[PDB]
Amino acid sequence: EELKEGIDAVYPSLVGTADSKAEGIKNYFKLSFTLPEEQKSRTVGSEAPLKDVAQALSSRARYELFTEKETANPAFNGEVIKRYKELMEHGEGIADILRSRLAKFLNTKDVGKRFAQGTEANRWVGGKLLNIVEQDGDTFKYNEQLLQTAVLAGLQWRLTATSNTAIKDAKDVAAITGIDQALLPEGLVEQFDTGMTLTEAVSSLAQKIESYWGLSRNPNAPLGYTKGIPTAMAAEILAAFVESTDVVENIVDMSEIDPDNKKTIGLYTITELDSFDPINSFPTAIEEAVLVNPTEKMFFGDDIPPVANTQLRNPAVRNTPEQKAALKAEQATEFYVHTPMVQFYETLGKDRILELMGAGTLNKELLNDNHAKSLEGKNRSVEDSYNQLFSVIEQVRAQSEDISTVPIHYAYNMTRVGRMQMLGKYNPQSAKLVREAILPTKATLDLSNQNNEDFSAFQLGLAQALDIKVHTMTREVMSDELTKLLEGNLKPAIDMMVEFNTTGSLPENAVDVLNTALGDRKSFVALMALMEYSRYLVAEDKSAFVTPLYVEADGVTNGPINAMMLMTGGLFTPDWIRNIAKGGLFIGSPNKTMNEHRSTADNNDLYQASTNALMESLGKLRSNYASNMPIQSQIDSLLSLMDLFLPDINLGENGALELKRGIAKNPLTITIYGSGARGIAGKLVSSVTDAIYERMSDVLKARAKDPNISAAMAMFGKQAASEAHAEELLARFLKDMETLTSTVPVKRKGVLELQSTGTGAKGKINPKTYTIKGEQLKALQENMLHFFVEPLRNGITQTVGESLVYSTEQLQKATQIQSVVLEDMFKQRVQEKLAEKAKDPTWKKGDFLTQKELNDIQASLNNLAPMIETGSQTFYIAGSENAEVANQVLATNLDDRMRVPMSIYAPAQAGVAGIPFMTIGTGDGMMMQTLSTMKGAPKNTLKIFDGMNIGLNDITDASRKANEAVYTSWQGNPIKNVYESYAKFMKNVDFSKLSPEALEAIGKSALEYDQRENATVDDIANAASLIERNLRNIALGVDIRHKVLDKVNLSIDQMAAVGAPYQNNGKIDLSNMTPEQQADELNKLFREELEARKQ
DNA sequence: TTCAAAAGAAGCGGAGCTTC
Ligand SMILES: Nc1ncnc2c1ncn2[C@@H]1O[C@H](COP(=O)(O)OP(=O)(O)OP(=O)(O)O)[C@@H](O)[C@H]1O
Ligand SMILES: Nc1nc2c(ncn2[C@@H]2O[C@H](COP(=O)(O)O)[C@@H](O)[C@H]2O)c(=O)[nH]1
Ligand SMILES: [Mn+2]
Ligand SMILES: [Mn+2]
Known part of the structure; x- marks a missing residue:
């Protein structure tokens, strides 16, 4: 533990002594952070980071030498270098503003003079930055290394933060604003999704600042300083960006939106750079210079993204080995630019794309005010997607001569609900504009004979893209519907695209031609279809036509069907058999497809x-x-x-x-x-x-x-x-x-x-x-x-069945009751530890607890089984990050504003989250995970949660694999998973130890409206105990049903379009039987299996 | 109570109550 002397060697002149027991001023930067054994940042030890990094960025040779790498990203060329020169100059401006703000802070109310006399201002919510200053004559000054490194983080944040913000929905805005979700005014959600809240802006900034500082947090230092110091720096940087007009601050008055609401809420928007700013072609030069292992970067060629160790924003949950294997598989997939679509987008131009796919130029007095608001948001989404795609294209364009030969990988992580989410706001998974320009799907087709299987696959892809519901009709019928469309309404559009693929030109009325031809079929994928069909028409070698056109195998009413299969617990009923068939579970019909079902049995x-x-x-x-x-x-x-x-x-x-x-x-x-x-x-x-x-x-x-x-x-x-x-x-x-x-x-x-x-x-x-x-x-x-x-x-x-509603109700109650206890006990154990920290003379209120202390509190809850395990997935339903635990400000800026609440990772009430967590998780989540890792897992696909884009060469096998993956997920038993966790919880919970508010919450879930009021601890205990029995019986039922189902001949086509169903090869033949006969037969098997166990 | 991420501002004083 010479760590103390090590960190002091690096910052010997910071004010105060690095000892928590010291008498006078103590330096909480040196107490909170240690040098890592392995370098994380290249600015550590640099006396002038801005000068040093600017020097690195001044030429390719210097950048390569600084990063200790032989070659630099080709996008780092002459124009880009000149732009970074200018941005480094701006960095000096931000640093200068920060220094003046500090000087002002020190002078006001004689804080600097008082600090020098020994008042511990460096422990105030607004003075934590005083831990990174140094004595300078009669006053103080920032340590230049820490200051300039933080400014570098600020510059990188300024460049790419907007690209990484979360999307806000109605629920979010309602929570932020405190306004009822149903009563949100028009465009309010739009205004809020456009900006960043204070917490949103500061936390992302603080994260980057701390990473660039390149140190490690001391497990035994109070979070008030480990989180507090970089947050204080971030708040100051945000304040400086407001002064510089790099960021616009808007304080939204809710009282004008609802006279009873008294909230005033800050929204922060980063001033967007010009769409043709060279820096857009390589916006991560600083990050890749400063960090040994950059998070923000594109992955070209065989530069493959690392696999995330923990669940996205749930650091308590490790990704399982199976989940990591799936992440690896998806990150291995090569995506490629489809040059014709990029050229099409380019030739149309942003303005015409907006006219075609957005709302075009708005005439504010030919529009209702509310409607106009909605239209602006529409334009925003398209324009941002367009700009983002072309920034990406400009970087790809630098990697080689042929842009369509540059492989692109994307990073993925597993979310709380077990979905593999592509990182980033505007990527192929999340943005439809981008999805048709950057694709992993590719095939060489023989389209020389319109009777080939290859042409049939081509047709299927075109038809689906043109909004023909291909899963509702056979391939043959689909073909005829597509043909009449192509030779009918679409022909003027196709003619225009033939011309484009010949001369590279579009007519001035291109938008009108496309709009009229497509009508309600208009979409980005429809444009791909028009492009690809016309390319085929002018193709010189139709026998070897290369196209990324895809077919999406998509889940038919996926969530509800999954819930019905996974959580129905009773005997089989005829209505369930008929309704589940609507989702592609066919009993006693070997090889039956969804296309056949819809066309001949049940539309x-x-x-x-x-x-x-x-x-x-x-x-x-x-x-x-x-x-x-x-x-x-x-x-x-x-x-x-x-x-x-x-x-x-x-x-x-x-x-x-x-x-x-x-x-x-x-x-x-x-x-x-x-x-x-x-x-x-x-x-x-x-x-x-x-x-x-x-x-x-x-x-x-x-x-x-x-x-x-x-x-x-x-x-x-x-x-x-x-x-x-x-x-x-x-x-x-x-x-x-x-x-x-x-x-x-x-x-x-x-x-x-x-x-x-x-x-x-x-x-x-x-x-x-x-x-x-x-x-x-x-x-x-x-x-x-x-x-x-x-x-x-x-x-x-x-429709879904009373039995399912019952199961989801029991699941919700169990997970809610458990989350209430976890949350309440966590809070109690926090306030206990805080009460004994008051006995400590070294501790000051506001310092909060150490990470080790929070780790111990979290580990103490382990006997309450907070985690649900399936064997291949892990769910933490109560897991959250809330300001309610610490209930205090973490840091402010030097103007006593931008007061960032202290947020802590802690369990919170689940509410109804248990249902979608388990249903999405063990349903589409498990299916996709299986699809990625199973024997003969489809390659070169793009997975979008319950749908999968497949190249035209492999639609048959990949679709059959998808339906097999569905069948595999239907072997799941999420209620049993919840039961196993809830039963451990019930063995260890002490309901008497709960706060009265927690007891009230549980009574809502465990007891009816009537017998709540004056319920005893014992009443609530017995009621919580009853739910365990309920879950146990449901779980046993589900397990029986799945075993019995596997005995019977099944054809599964839930991932429908192609008509390639998975057959389970069950030996008991239930063909030539009504649902009533089938139900009786299945129930005979159910009872017999129930006796195999009662024995 | 759908889920996939949280989330008021600011004077005075040096935390946390108060008012908008
Ligand atoms: N608003 C939502 N809230 C919660 N979950 C959703 C929501 N929208 C979609 N999902 C989840 O994603 C799945 C896929 O949605 P999708 O858009 O494919 O519709 P779907 O329910 O499968 O119906 P279909 O595909 O037949 O139109 C859903 O079944 C559901 O589990
Ligand atoms: N959990 C959840 N998933 C959604 C929601 N909206 C869309 N999705 C998922 O995202 C898909 C939409 O993909 P796209 O619309 O871009 O083709 C849906 O089919 C579904 O899987 C939502 O509100 N909640
Ligand atoms: Mn679907
Ligand atoms: Mn879908």
Whole structure:
């Protein structure tokens, strides 16, 4: 332990003594960090990092010598070098701002003078940077090595941070803003997804700063300094970037968005560089210079990414050997630029891509205000994807002469839910624009004979890309549908693309040609199909046509089907057999495919089925209120309004209701995953309000090109067949909007009751400003809830099965109860340790605990089995990072602002997370992991969670392997996995030790509404104990069903399109039998197996 | 309570209560 003398040798002039027991000023930088045994950063020991690194970046020869490497990235050329010269100059500016800010801090309130006199300002939330200063006459100055190294981290962050930010959804923004998710204003989520919160910006900056400092954290130093010092530096750097206008700070006032909300929230946006800035072609030169092992970089050729040791953002969870093997396999795959698509994108140009695939140039006064907001976000996503792709292309272009011959690898990690996620915001897995330009799929096809198998595969790929639902029809029927499309509507587009593949030119009306030809089939993959078909047409050697066009084997209603197979625990029923067949589990039909099923047996998938069940429940609901005209009229008005604006719901002249599967897709999925009905009602209303906002733009538009237009024709012209027929729709819209906002249903002791809101919609419509706000949105939602969502939920249960709903309920309760205990005991053991740290004279409140202390607290919870293990995957449902444990500020900037809360890795309540964790995890998660590692694992694919892109040469075998992987995952038993963990928990939990709030939480899950109130510790214990028995019985049931199923002849085509089902070769033949006969036969096997064990 | 990542700001004082 001469570590102390080692770190002191490197920073001998930092102020204070490196001893926690010392009397005067103590230096918590030297106490917190040690020199690594193996160098991590090349700036350690450098007296002037900015000068030294700038020198390294000044030429290829110097860079190579600095990095001690023979060759540098070819993208590091003349123009790029000049740009880095300028950025290094800017680094000096950031350093200069930081020095002045420090000088100001020291002078204000005589802090520097007081610090010199011995007041421990270096332990204040705003003074932790005083641990990296040095005495300078009558004042203090930054240690230049630590300062300039941090600035280097700031520069790299500035260059690439936006490229690595998380995507924000409604849930995120609702949590950030404290505004109800259903009541979020238009474009608010968009504004927030665009910027970074304080925590978001500072934590990412702090991470980079600490890595560039290249030291190791002392396990026995308080986290208030190990995390606090680099966070304090990051806050100062962020503040300097605001001063320099590299970052824009926007403090969003929630009170203008909701008068009762008092939150004011900072949003930080990095000023984007020019799209044609040479630095975009190689934005990681600093990182690759400073770090011995850079995280941020592209991987070309045989430079292969390392395999992540721990689950993404769950450092307590190691990736299993099987998971690591899968990660390795996916990281081995070579991706290649498809030159024709890049050239097509380039020739169209960003502006026309936006016009075609985004919203083009917005005319802010031909658009409803809310609609305009939505359009901007649309443009944002496309434009960012476009810019990111071409930055990547510019770097690839430097690697060699032929850009299509440069292999590209991508890093992956395993997420909390067991999915293999490609790292990065804009990569082939996550961005559709990029997916069609950089592909691992490649094949050489013989297309000289349109009767070849190769041509059939080619056709399949084209058809799927052109939005023909290829899994619903046989290959032969598909072919005819594709042919008539190509020779019909698409022909003018194909002609244009033939020309492009000849001369390299597009007509000035290219966007109109594509838009008209494609219509609703328009997508990036559709453009690939047009490109590839036209390339085939002009190909000189059709016998050896090279194309990356792919076929996606995609899971049919994957999540719900997986849940039904994995977590249904009872006897077999005929309804389950029919419904599971909708997802590709065929019993007693050797070699049956999904294409055959859909075309000859059952054209309705699981979502359509639930939709038909919804119509039954809606009819049932009407009957119960048959004589109640106000209620009948209220229901009619809701269905009327949805019919006006939604595609998936249509009503006829006689009130005949017709619904499409699309309206049930999301609600069915999230219902299984524990979503409440109110959230679903909010999403449905949002779909409606979006469409009317859009239709309002149409008003503004049609009114512009014709002032004389009637409001009826201005709003419903496009949708009607006549003048008078249009005022009928307008009258409907007005009647519906009035009755749905002025009157709401409420459930009173089981019965539906209509009440006046007193806040009904009144006034002439102003198309530009028109906004459905607060009280009116809530009204629509309450109507949607009781008259649509609630019948839908009934239909959902009837479709997936009451038995599954029961299993998911037991799973949720068990994992929630366990997470509550983990969280509460963690917090208790923290506040215990803090109470004895108060006895320590060396300890100050704000220092918090050491890592070793937190490790010991975490390890103490091990007997409560926080981890769920399957044998090939590990799940940590309660795992999180929250500010609630420490409940204190970690650091501020030197202006007493940018107050970063102290966040700690700790268990938190699971809520309903247990359901999707296990279902996604042991379902599609396990399938993909199996697909990557199984014998004869498909090569050269791109896996996207429940779908897999396959090159045209291998569609048959890869699809059969995918269906085999499905069958393998269906041998899983996630309830048994949860049971094993929960039973260990039950053996060791002490419910009496829990805080009253924790006990209340558990009572919600373990007890009914009635017997909570005054429940004893013992009551809650017995109830938690009952859930264990429930899980045990479910688990045994699931295990039996899977064994019995494996005995029978099965054809599995859940990963559908190609028509290559996996056959399990079960010996018991259940062909020529109805589902009823099959169910009886399976139940005979079930009982017999149940006796094999009761013995 | 769907899941895949969290997440108010700022004066005064030197933590943490307070007000917007
Ligand atoms: N909004 C969501 N919330 C939670 N999980 C989701 C959500 N969307 C998709 N998933 C998960 O990803 C899976 C794949 O989604 P996908 O878009 O392929 O739809 P799907 O449910 O398979 O239906 P289909 O593919 O037949 O249209 C889902 O089954 C579900 O498990
Ligand atoms: N868990 C989860 N997965 C999603 C969600 N949205 C999309 N996905 C996954 O991402 C896929 C979308 O891929 P793409 O739409 O780019 O073709 C879906 O099929 C599904 O696997 C979501 O909200 N939650
Ligand atoms: Mn799917
Ligand atoms: Mn999919």
